[PDB]
């Protein structure tokens, strides 16, 4: 009966152009909403590319306003927190505005390009550790490259310094869930599919380090995979739009994906967490409402 519970919704910032949501952010909004108020949510996690198409300009633009605050307004959303990273678009913005407005608005928690956040289930010891990346700065701008594949990071330094950040937080943790999120993701069948950077650099340390599960957006759709290792991945890129392709299917290992969800004519959907002493599950929920899929992971123990 302890339980941590939170939603995670990625790719949702809507669009620059009047009315400055489309008709999938909206019906997340409302989805995510009602999921709130019947299953509760301790708070929600945004995968990045938070406002399309090139971010914000400072911490008082409109577009906080235009694509976040007003249309997550719901009064079941009221006082739940939402703790945010970056994509790649907004990062073709201004994306200190994005973390100074953690100052402005109470429930936007954007304290760093990459933090770490912890947790203890209520009415338990069990403990949570999410490490919320910035796979921008760590593996560069896919909007860079024709490829949009992000292909080299522009500051070497700053990709170093992060992964080493990574690399001292994961061999450190001590919590018996460790969760890792990031925009771009390890692996996917879709339109961007795996990256690169990712595969080569993070993976080894999830593995090492008995990582729970990655969980990403930037493919804008709902996937679960799982390697051999049990370790999860659960992409959630579907808050604003639904790509339903699979042109990267055969650049992930046989086996790993286990679900995928992308039709076009969905509204989208989102991903929900419960984490209890026993074990976490994770459910895809489609922006009418319809639970897609739900799978179980385990407590690592520690
Ligand atoms: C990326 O985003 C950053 C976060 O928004 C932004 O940094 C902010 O820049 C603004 C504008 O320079 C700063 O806001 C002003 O601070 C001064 C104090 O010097 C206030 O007096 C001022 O008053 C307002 O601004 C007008 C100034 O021309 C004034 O006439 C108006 O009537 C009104 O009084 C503003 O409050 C703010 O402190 C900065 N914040 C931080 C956290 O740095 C970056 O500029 C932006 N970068 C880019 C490249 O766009
Ligand atoms: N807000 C809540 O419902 C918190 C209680 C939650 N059901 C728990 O057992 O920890
Ligand atoms: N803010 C809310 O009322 C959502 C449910 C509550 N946060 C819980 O965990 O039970
Ligand atoms: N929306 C704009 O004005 C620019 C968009 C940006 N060039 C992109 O590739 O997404
Ligand atoms: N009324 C509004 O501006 C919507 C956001 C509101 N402050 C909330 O937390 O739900
Ligand atoms: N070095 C850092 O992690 C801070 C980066 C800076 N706040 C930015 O995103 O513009
Ligand atoms: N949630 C956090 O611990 C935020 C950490 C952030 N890097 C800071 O020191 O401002
Ligand atoms: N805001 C939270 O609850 C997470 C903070 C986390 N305990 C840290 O110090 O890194
Ligand atoms: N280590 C923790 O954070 C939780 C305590 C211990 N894993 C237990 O529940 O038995
Ligand atoms: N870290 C930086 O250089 C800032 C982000 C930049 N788009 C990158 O390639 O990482
Ligand atoms: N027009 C584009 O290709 C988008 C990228 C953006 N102009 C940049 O500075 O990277
Ligand atoms: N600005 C550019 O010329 C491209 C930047 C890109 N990060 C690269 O070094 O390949
Ligand atoms: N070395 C320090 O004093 C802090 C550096 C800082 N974390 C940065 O990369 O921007
Ligand atoms: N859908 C997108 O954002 C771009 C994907 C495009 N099909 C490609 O060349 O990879
Ligand atoms: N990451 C992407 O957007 C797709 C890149 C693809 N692997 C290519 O080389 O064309
Ligand atoms: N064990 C495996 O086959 C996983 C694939 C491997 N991680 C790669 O670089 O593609
Ligand atoms: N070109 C690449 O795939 C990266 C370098 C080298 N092949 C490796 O082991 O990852
Ligand atoms: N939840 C888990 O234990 C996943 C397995 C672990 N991440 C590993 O690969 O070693
Ligand atoms: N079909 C495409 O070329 C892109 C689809 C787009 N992502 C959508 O929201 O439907
Ligand atoms: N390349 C871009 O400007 C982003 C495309 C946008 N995400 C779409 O699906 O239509
Ligand atoms: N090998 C395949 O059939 C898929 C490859 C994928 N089209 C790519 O661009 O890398
Ligand atoms: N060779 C494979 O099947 C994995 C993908 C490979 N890294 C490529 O870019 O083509
Ligand atoms: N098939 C389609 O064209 C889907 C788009 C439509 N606006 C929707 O959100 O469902
Ligand atoms: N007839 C169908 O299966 C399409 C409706 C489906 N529930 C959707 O909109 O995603
Ligand atoms: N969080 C968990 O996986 C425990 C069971 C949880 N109550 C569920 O909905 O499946
Ligand atoms: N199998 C499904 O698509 C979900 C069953 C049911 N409609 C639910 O959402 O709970
Ligand atoms: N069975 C389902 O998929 C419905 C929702 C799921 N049981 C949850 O706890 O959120
Ligand atoms: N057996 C099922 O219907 C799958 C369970 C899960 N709740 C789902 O609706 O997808
Ligand atoms: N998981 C799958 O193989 C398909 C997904 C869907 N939840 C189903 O049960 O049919
Ligand atoms: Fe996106
Ligand atoms: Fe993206
Ligand atoms: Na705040």
Redesign the pocket.
């Known amino acids: 009966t302890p339980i941590l519970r939170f939603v995670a919704v990625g790719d949702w910032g809507g669009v620059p152009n009047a009315p400055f949501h489309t008709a999938?952010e909206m019906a997340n909004a409302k989805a995510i909403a009602t999921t709130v108020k019947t299953l509760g949510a301790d708070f929600i996690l945004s995968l990045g590319d938070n406002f399309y198409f090139t971010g914000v300009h400072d911490a008082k633009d409109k577009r906080f306003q235009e694509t976040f605050e007003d249309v997550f307004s719901d009064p079941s959303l009221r006082n739940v927190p939402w703790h945010v990273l970056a994509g790649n678009h907004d990062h073709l913005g201004n994306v200190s505005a994005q973390i100074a407005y953690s100052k402005i608005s109470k429930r936007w928690n954007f304290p760093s390009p990459y933090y770490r956040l912890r947790f203890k289930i209520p009415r338990s010891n069990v403990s949570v550790a999410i490490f919320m990346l910035d796979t921008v700065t760590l593996c560069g701008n896919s909007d860079d490259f024709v490829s949009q594949q992000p292909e080299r990071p522009r500051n070497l330094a700053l990709a170093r310094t992060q992964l080493a950040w990574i690399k001292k937080q994961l061999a450190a943790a001590k919590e018996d869930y460790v969760l890792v999120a990031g925009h771009y993701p390890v692996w996917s069948i879709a339109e961007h599919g795996p990256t690169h950077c990712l595969v080569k650099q993070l993976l080894p340390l999830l593995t090492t380090h008995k990582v729970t599960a990655y969980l990403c957006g930037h493919d804008?759709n709902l996937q679960y995979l799982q390697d051999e290792n049990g370790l999860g991945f659960v992409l959630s890129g579907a808050g604003?739009?639904?790509?339903?392709?699979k042109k990267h299917l055969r650049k992930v290992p046989n086996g790993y994906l286990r679900f995928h969800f992308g039709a076009?004519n969905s509204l989208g959907g989102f991903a929900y967490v419960e984490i209890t002493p026993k074990e976490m599950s994770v459910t895809y929920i489609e922006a009418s409402g319809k639970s897609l899929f739900k799978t179980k992971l385990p407590r690592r123990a520690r």
């Open positions: 999938r804008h604003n739009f639904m790509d339903p392709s076009e």
